[PDB]
Amino acid sequence: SGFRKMAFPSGKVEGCMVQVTCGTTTLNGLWLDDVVYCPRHVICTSEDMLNPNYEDLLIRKSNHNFLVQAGNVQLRVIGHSMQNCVLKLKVDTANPKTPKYKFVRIQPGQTFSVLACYNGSPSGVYQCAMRPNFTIKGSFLNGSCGSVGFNIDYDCVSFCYMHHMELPTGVHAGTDLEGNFYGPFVDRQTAQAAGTDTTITVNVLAWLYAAVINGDRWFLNRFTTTLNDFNLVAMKYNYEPLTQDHVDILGPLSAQTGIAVLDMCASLKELLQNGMNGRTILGSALLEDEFTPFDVVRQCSGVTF
Amino acid sequence: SGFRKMAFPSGKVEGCMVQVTCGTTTLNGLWLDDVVYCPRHVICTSEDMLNPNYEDLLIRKSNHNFLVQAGNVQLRVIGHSMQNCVLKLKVDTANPKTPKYKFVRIQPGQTFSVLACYNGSPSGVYQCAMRPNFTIKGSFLNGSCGSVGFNIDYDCVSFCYMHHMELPTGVHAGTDLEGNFYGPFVDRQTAQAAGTDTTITVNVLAWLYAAVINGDRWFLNRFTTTLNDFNLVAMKYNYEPLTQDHVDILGPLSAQTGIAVLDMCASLKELLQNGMNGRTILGSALLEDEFTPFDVVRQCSGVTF
Numbered sequence: 001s002g003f004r005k006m007a008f009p010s011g012k013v014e015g016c017m018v019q020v021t022c023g024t025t026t027l028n029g030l031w032l033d034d035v036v037y038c039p040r041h042v043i044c045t046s047e048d049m050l051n052p053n054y055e056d057l058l059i060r061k062s063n064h065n066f067l068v069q070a071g072n073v074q075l076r077v078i079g080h081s082m083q084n085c086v087l088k089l090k091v092d093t094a095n096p097k098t099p100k101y102k103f104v105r106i107q108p109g110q111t112f113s114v115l116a117c118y119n120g121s122p123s124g125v126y127q128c129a130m131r132p133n134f135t136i137k138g139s140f141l142n143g144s145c146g147s148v149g150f151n152i153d154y155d156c157v158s159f160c161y162m163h164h165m166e167l168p169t170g171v172h173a174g175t176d177l178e179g180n181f182y183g184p185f186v187d188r189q190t191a192q193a194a195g196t197d198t199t200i201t202v203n204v205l206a207w208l209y210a211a212v213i214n215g216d217r218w219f220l221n222r223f224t225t226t227l228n229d230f231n232l233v234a235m236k237y238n239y240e241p242l243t244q245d246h247v248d249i250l251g252p253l254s255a256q257t258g259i260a261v262l263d264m265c266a267s268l269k270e271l272l273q274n275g276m277n278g279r280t281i282l283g284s285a286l287l288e289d290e291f292t293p294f295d296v297v298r299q300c301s302g303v304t305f
Numbered sequence: 306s307g308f309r310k311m312a313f314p315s316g317k318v319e320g321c322m323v324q325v326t327c328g329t330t331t332l333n334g335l336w337l338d339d340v341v342y343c344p345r346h347v348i349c350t351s352e353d354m355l356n357p358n359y360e361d362l363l364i365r366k367s368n369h370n371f372l373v374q375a376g377n378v379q380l381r382v383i384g385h386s387m388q389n390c391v392l393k394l395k396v397d398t399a400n401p402k403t404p405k406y407k408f409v410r411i412q413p414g415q416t417f418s419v420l421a422c423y424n425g426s427p428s429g430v431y432q433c434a435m436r437p438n439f440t441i442k443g444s445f446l447n448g449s450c451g452s453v454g455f456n457i458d459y460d461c462v463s464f465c466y467m468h469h470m471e472l473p474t475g476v477h478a479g480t481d482l483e484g485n486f487y488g489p490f491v492d493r494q495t496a497q498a499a500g501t502d503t504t505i506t507v508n509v510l511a512w513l514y515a516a517v518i519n520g521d522r523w524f525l526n527r528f529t530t531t532l533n534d535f536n537l538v539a540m541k542y543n544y545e546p547l548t549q550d551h552v553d554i555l556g557p558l559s560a561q562t563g564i565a566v567l568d569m570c571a572s573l574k575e576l577l578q579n580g581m582n583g584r585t586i587l588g589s590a591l592l593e594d595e596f597t598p599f600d601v602v603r604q605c606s607g608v609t610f
């Protein structure tokens with residue numbers, strides 16, 4: 001019993017974290033095989049960040065301008081190149097701790113674990129979701145740039161996020177490991193803002209199924225709804241639309257609890273229109289949307305890595 | 306910016322998890338140096354769990370009755386002894402992945418990370434707190450016994466909890482790493498129940514200071530309170546009494562934000578009376594009590610927004 005916001009074990013990723021320094025700027029790097037990946041803004045001064053020409057800034061650097069530290073060992077940089085908003089530093093030593101890995105680009109609603117790092121040293125691990133407005137609600141201070149997000153599939157680490165910046169609302173923006181930003185963001189000190197966010201509907205439904213599995217059933221009702229009527233309701237409350245794909249993905253949870261997906265949608269409709277009435281679900285007075293259907297199945301079945 | 310329920314990176318603990326088998330029972334063990342620590346109930350059958358005589362069950366075992374598996378390698382047991390409710394299995398190989406460690410017994414209100422394991426394999430990491438009734442609200446399934454709780458302040462792992470059982474309310478009970486239970490619990494299937502739980506007041510106060518540091522003040526008021534009047538009101542909401550020790554511990558956060566501890570106590574009194582009126586504090590509609598004063602200082606910025 002119990003239901004917690006659970007992150008993947010971070011060990012395979014901790015063995016890849018390094019410290020990257022270019023002049024006065026120090027941030028985190030991800031060392032896989034003989035390459036260290038880090039945000040390309042490591043080459044910028046505070047003035048350069050206002051309007052950087054990254055190719056022009058990079059051409060002026062040599063391999064020895066980049067200091068890479070792995071624990072108490074200095075790595076030798078033998079090459080450097082840029083891919084989108086990510087700098088790739090070729091080093092003379094392959095990481096002996098390189099796990100089996102993939103680089104994957106995730107979609108809004110998908111969750112992942114973040115290993116927050118400072119000076120190439122991991123400080124914490126938390127779970128979060130890619131919001132529909134492509135930001136993440138992380139917990140990051142100065143020096144956290146280069147911290148990565150990931151999932152684990154059996155013994156394979158799928159790297160999906162690298163931290164680049166904090167927006168004025170305190171939320172975070174970053175890229176996939178190929179340097180492509182999530183969202184309409186750019187890597188420079190200029191006016192940028194997160195768009196209006198929405199709630200991840202399929203994830204709220206998965207979390208309601210998790211509450212039922214844990215004995216919380218007060219919100220269940222005798223009613224059902226059509227998919228179209230539910231989306232008309234959900235659109236009124238800034239909820240993301242529920243597609244037939246989402247209904248298919250919730251099938252296993254629906255069979256396990258005996259509550260049809262549109263039956264659980266009628267519970268969610270009533271919760272939006274009337275509130276919780278002083279009650280909580282899994283210790284929360286808000287409808288939680290940072291657990292996917294897969295996370296619920298994994299936590300309620302004990303899958304190991 | 307941001308404030309998340311953050312666990313310590315689990316890598317140092319993942320390298321210590323092993324699978325312990327005694328007959329038909331399989332659970333998790335913690336391998337440090339040449340000793341594997343696990344719950345003593347691994348020697349029990351389901352027919353022994355009501356009134357087990359552990360000394361009598363243990364004397365009938367030899368070293369070769371204990372099967373210890375570390376990854377795909379079978380460890381050789383060369384000794385066994387019981388210390389309180391933990392079994393200590395001496396093995397012929399010291400763990401090469403043994404981190405710098407300590408065994409610490411924690412007090413109610415203290416937080417720690419849990420690395421949930423099944424069959425000696427880590428499945429997830431979450432943060433939690435020792436409740437005032439000595440239980441923990443974990444997320445554990447059958448086979449999770451022997452999973453450990455820990456803190457990693459600096460480079461040293463302080464092991465503080467080993468999981469033993471789930472109570473009828475779905476909450477969990479366990480021991481320190483010397484096998485002494487937290488709370489009035491015994492490792493028997495006899496009728497046992499968690500006492501009425503309370504909210505960890507010093508932790509809610511620390512979390513209100515974290516909200517101020519991150520830029521939020523809507524909940525403050527022009528009032529102060531005596532420590533005695535605050536406790537008379539707090540106890541009516543099932544809040545733990547706030548001692549002078551707690552007021553002293555909140556001193557650094559009080560100096561950083563400019564809000565005296567008894568002024569923050571007045572704001573908490575008003576919050577308990579009024580609720581949140583549709584507002585949230587750090588993304589929550591409930592008052593959070595699983596962040597200690599020390600956790601807030603570790604996670605938050607040193608500069609108040």
Ligand SMILES: O=C(CN1C[C@@H](C(=O)Nc2cncc3ccccc23)c2cc(Cl)ccc2C1=O)NC1CC1
Pocket residue numbers: 041049140141142143144145164165166167168186187188189190306
């Ligand atoms: O004032 C600045 C300067 N700051 C630097 C850096 C950046 O955002 N870094 C950070 C990341 N994550 C958390 C942080 C917490 C506190 C301070 C900096 C953080 C950046 C990176 C990029 Cl790609 C574009 C612009 C900026 C940019 O403005 N800080 C941001 C907060 C406001």
Ligand SMILES: O=C(CN1C[C@@H](C(=O)Nc2cncc3ccccc23)c2cc(Cl)ccc2C1=O)NC1CC1
Pocket residue numbers: 001346354445446447448449450469470471472473477491492493494
């Ligand atoms: O049905 C039982 C049998 N069960 C076995 C075991 C125990 O509590 N194991 C477990 C731990 N953590 C989470 C679990 C989740 C589901 C099932 C077992 C779990 C135990 C250990 C000890 Cl030391 C004392 C009593 C018991 C004991 O009653 N109790 C469970 C239903 C709550």
Ligand SMILES: [Cl-]
Pocket residue numbers: 410411412415
């Ligand atoms: Cl303590």
